[model samples]
Structures are given as structure tokens and as C-alpha cells.
Target chain A: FVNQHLCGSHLVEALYLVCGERGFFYTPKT
Target chain B: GIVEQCCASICSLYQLENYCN
Candidate 1:
């Protein structure tokens, strides 16, 4: 891995960056 | 380099998504 694999908190941050308001933890429920 | 890093991260996510299925 070139940039150090994203894990735990790092993975959460990556999801936020890529998903924004639609992140899995905060996306509106159906 | 922040922007490049972001792009790389997202690109990595893309690869993972493909592999997961």
C-alpha cells in the first residue's frame, strides 16, 4: 500500500471524504 | 499533494469495491 491502508478511524474518514453527507454511518434511513 | 492523496484514496476504494463482489 502506497499511502498506508485506511483502517478503523482512517477508514471512517475516507468514507466521509468520498461519500460526504451520504456516509454509511450518517446517511438518511429509508 | 492533498488533492492527489485524496484521489489516490478514492481510487483505492474503487478497487476494493470491485474486488468485494
Candidate 2:
């Protein structure tokens, strides 16, 4: 159920998470 | 083109950096 949940929705949200998490550590100039 | 940078960034994370550019 949980596996499909991410696959079904918020897939793009993962990118947002990555942006915040990674960008927090290493901010991009852009 | 700020988002443009992220466009390739996302595409790179998605492992399609080849065409992301």
C-alpha cells in the first residue's frame, strides 16, 4: 500500500524533498 | 533560467541527464 502510495502520488514531491534536503546542505547558485 | 537549472538537475536525478540539457 505504501509503495503504491508514493508511486501513485507525490512522485514529484520526492524531487522537492531532494531539493530542500540537498539544497540545504549544498545550495545551488540557481 | 533558474528553473532551467533545476530542469536539468531533476532530469539528472531522474537519470536522464543525457537529454535533460
Q: Encode model 1's per-residue lDDT on B1-21: one tens digit a residue.
A: 222333434436654333221
Report per-prediction Cα RMSD to one decimal. Answer: 10.8, 9.6
lDDT of 2: 0.34
**Between which residue pairs do clashes occur in model 1?**
none
Model 2 chain A: lowest-lDDT 10 consecutive positions:
A1-10
lDDT of 2 by residue, B1-21 (tens): 323444333334443222122
| Cα error of candidate 1 at position B7, Å | 18
On lDDT, the leading prediction is 1
- Per-candidate TM equals 0.40, 0.22
lDDT for position B9 in model 2:
32
Candidate 1: CAPRI quality band: incorrect
Those runs of model 2 whose alpha carbons end farther than 4 Å from true positions after fitting are A1-9, A21-30, B1-21
Could you give candidate 2's per-residue lDDT for residues A1-30 as a string of tens digits?
A: 122223212434534464554432222244
